[PDB]
């Protein structure tokens, strides 16, 4: 559902 950089 939405951005991160290793995870939710």
């Amino acid at each position, epitope marked *: 559902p939405y*951005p*991160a*950089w*290793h*995870a*939710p």
Partner: antibody
Amino acid sequence: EVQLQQSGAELVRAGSSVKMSCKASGYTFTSYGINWVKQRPGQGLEWIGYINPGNGYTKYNEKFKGKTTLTVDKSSSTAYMQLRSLTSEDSAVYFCARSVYYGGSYYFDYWGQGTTLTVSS
Amino acid sequence: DIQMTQTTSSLSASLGDRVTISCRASQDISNYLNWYQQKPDGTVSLLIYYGSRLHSGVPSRFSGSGSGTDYSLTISNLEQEDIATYFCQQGNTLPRTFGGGTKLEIKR
């Protein structure tokens, strides 16, 4: 070496705000992310959020969002974190750290000395 | 999200022993675990990263392991210099979370 010199201790009144620095040195500032961790001297470390210097992208920890704002300036390799509507609960030492990629994730390989923030009148 | 429980707040040992600091994720982290060592003076530095195996230029006597929810930092042949607080951190999901940390002290 890689270095991160954070700001000097800060003294501010609840209701007010503050803006701390994290000046990077010895590496390409835009090739790595800056994370902010708070350590209230209670029980551990908290991940605030973080930012990609080149990207300008920011990802917050739901808790610290709304009152926190991460930014960066790259014509001087510095990153800033601004805290708003301060309260007793924001008295802590704040650290910034570099993020490196590995596997499919990150970890913090270098940190700053830290910035002490005392919210008081 | 995943929260880490370092389940011992203060750990007690003698210079020279094999110290083992643990850390448990409330869910599988596919070995996305890192270890930091904070000193009394306040400064923090990295030790071991990824699944707990990987070294960042440090004494060999620092070793990590673990596999699902259970991990550990093991300082064999302990040393003065090593008396500090150790925090584990999960890098599998957001938000990033650390454990309560474990502080070593000298046994008397």
